[model samples]
Target: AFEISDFKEHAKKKSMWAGALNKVTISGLMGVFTEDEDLMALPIHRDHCPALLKIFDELIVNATDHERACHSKTKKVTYIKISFDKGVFSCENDGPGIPIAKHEQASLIAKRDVYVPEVASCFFLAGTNINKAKDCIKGGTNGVGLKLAMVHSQWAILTTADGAQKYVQQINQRLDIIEPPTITPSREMFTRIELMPVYQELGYAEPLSETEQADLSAWIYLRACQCAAYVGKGTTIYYNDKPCRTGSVMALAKMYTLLSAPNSTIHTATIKADAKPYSLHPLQVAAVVSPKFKKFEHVSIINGVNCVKGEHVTFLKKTINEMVIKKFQQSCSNIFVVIVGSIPGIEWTGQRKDELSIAENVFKTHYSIPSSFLTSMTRSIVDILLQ
Candidate 1:
């Protein structure tokens, strides 16, 4: 039923979706990386810190440049790899690597940017740029480049050895927030990035498969490599977690798909007024309370909770009224319900409020409740109770 062009079009749309979701994933990962370990042990909340997203975007851009600089020919980068475990992320690249002089310059520039944040204002930081390249291939544009890694991460360790000896820089926020430039590095050439996760802010309890983690890293790596290829160098990337071979575009496509789709399993739960007391896992609780209403064809239970595809808040209120409030009107007549869920891409604003109001009115009329009574009851039980 679909042509080759149709598949291509779908793929294009999917790629865009993947990129958008990647931003969220990266932010979540960074939040886990940068928060205090003790704090990270607590339950993750979206509001734990808003700075997590900003830092994630900056760090990704910084790594993009590192990938580009590894190009050999006209400086076309060929390979990039990433892995994470426990509470640490490691991003490594193979290209021209970093010479000692360039490394020192980047260190000095990063320091200045941190002390004077307003001095240079741009998307990519200044020191991230590769000076040895013919033109700016990739990496570092804004002066605050490397400092982002320093600020966003509780600990940042960078190692590059392209010539005779290796060059390294390490900073720990718990100790010294900034490290002065030092040169005791050795020979060999490669770029390695390791960051410790701030545990309390991130949600996922299970570790990502090495394959899944590397897949995302490779996508970014390949994009930068493709850009660098225009300059003339061929780059090669390697990873211990993924089976993707170098020089294969299809492998990259698969990686993109894996990262873009709904990788998390749906969870569900049921809360009743008269049932025995019980608790559900976070995922299950999230599913039961999720505002996502478009995925199901009708009501069904993937787990124990009955779920339906419709407007979330409206449906939730109906379910509560029918199953709990009405059923136990004489026992505990006054009941307050609070439901919350993270809906990706749903912006809550004045416009959304109008739409939600209209939807709520439709639910009321369909359910045969007088408008005034429905409004008054809902206001009394849910709205006024919040205050």
Candidate 2:
């Protein structure tokens, strides 16, 4: 019984990107320019490094953003749960589900103009809920994450409930809809997605061994912990039905501290500040330092996508060297720092968005560290080193 207007009203209250829905067009769909069916259909796994991790990260972060945004004005505490079991991955969020109304334009998945519900279109289209704002700070930026996870998976089932009814859709290996979406009566609001992964299809040359599988499980857990840290106190995350600890950042720092400098004490600090004229989102820097290590390591997260190396990482490293290591006459090998930033009109080196870049401008600075961030970081690192 819900109409597009009803969906808009509900979305106006619970979703941040409701206004962007009307602007969706074929040009908005990334990689649709390719005439290659398979290439356009599944664009993530083969190119994205750490393909499996990106899939998990994207889905988890997307759910987290949805829950946090939907519950921002309400007194309710937001929550997202994710689990991987027996080669299947699933994520569930207690938030306003995706809109049920069919989109106004034909999706790129179709040969010609055709209508599909927002729930179904999101997996096949890449422009829904996109933030056109220049000064915005939210996840779900690229609009490709969920679709990437879906197409890479052997099969995916999406279930969304808006107060009136529950709707479910199933998609298979070729990204073909298995059947028309099923609708039934329901009063609850939530979204759940289940994915069955195909190891070889996801870039594994051969079947993974038990040891590799265990390692993969461990890697996923650590990423979950980092995500819990990112989500902070407002949202509680559960893995396999058990609650995850909130002090996850320090826990991760401790792991590095133990392996690098077992006999030395660990020191850590975090700072948040607005990097105006450079980024739209406030920059957050966190560092863990110890007496010794083999080498220094750092990572930056831009708009929720991890950038292992780029201009951002280069700036962060240079800041540490000039501010902490050289100032204290210490080697740069003992510290680990993480910088989280977002820039306006962000561009990635490739479809994977694994690293940040601009067109023919490797030397140009897209985002620079604010003096305030550097000053605070310097003071904190100095204090840690003295201690």
Q: How well is each residue in 13-127 modelled by candidate 2, as lDDT tens digits?
A: 2212211211122111111111332111111222222455556776776776665455556533366788878778888887677666555554444444333433343443355
Runs in model 2 lying further than 4 Å from the true structure: 1-49, 75-77, 107-125, 129-131, 203-208, 246-248, 262-270, 274-284, 324-331, 340-345, 357-387
lDDT of 1 by residue, 210-253 (tens): 54344433333343322222222244333335422323322222
> After superposition, which runs of candidate 1 have C-alpha atoms over 4 Å from their true positions?
1-63, 66-76, 102-125, 128-140, 174-176, 179-185, 201-240, 243-387
Q: Pick the candidate with the highest TM-score.
A: 2
Number of the top-ranking candidate, with lDDT as the measure? 2
RMSD to true structure for each model, in Å: 20.4, 12.5
